[PDB]
Design a protein around this ligand. Structure first.
Ligand SMILES: CN1CC[C@H](Oc2cccc(F)c2)C1=O
Length: 165
């Protein structure tokens, strides 16, 4: 049972105009089997549009490629992103109620990426927990992995997680 193809793709921006299907493939095959690899070109001039995409056989291979950033492809640092692009480093986490603490959020979310800020929201008047939080990571891929999951279970609660700002 293969993961949906959409979840196995990486959109690569910032390509050198000299990158080809073949050179993009040779680079990204270092992190997995590529079932597809395309440089986007103008239909008349054939000149590169400066971006393309690759499709891996599995999501773990996407992860491996993302974990190997920064990628210098044909002499230029490129910008790979997965499909979810609203590129942000912060998430809203809702439904955590009053008993969820910082360490619950950190122990779970730290496995998606490096956390810089955890903000458990409290009432401006009473100080009581409001039941939601924001987590800021050092990089957008953490957020992208998070928001494509169907479910997040933290401190026994099924949470609603969305990109923030
Ligand atoms: C999630 N996004 C935003 C841009 C990207 O657009 C494309 C579309 C086709 C080929 C390609 F190489 C890139 C995409 O599908």
């Amino acid at each position: 049972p293969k993961e949906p193809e959409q979840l196995r793709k990486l959109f690569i921006g910032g390509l050198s105009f000299e990158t080809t299907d073949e050179s993009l493939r040779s680079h990204f095959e270092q992190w997995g089997t590529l079932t597809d690899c395309v440089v986007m070109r103008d239909p008349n001039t054939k000149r590169s549009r400066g971006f393309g995409f690759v499709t891996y056989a599995t999501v773990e291979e996407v992860d491996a490629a993302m974990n190997a950033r920064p990628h210098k492809v044909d002499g230029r640092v490129v910008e790979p992103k997965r499909a979810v692009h609203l590129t942000v480093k912060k998430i809203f986490v809702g439904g955590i109620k009053e008993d969820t603490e910082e360490h619950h959020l950190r122990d779970y979310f730290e496995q998606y990426g490096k956390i810089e800020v955890i903000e458990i929201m409290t009432d401006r008047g009473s100080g009581k927990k409001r039941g939601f939080a924001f987590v800021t990571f050092d990089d957008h891929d953490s957020v992208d992995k998070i928001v494509i999951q169907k479910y997040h279970t933290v401190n026994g609660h099924n949470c609603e997680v969305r990109k923030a700002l």
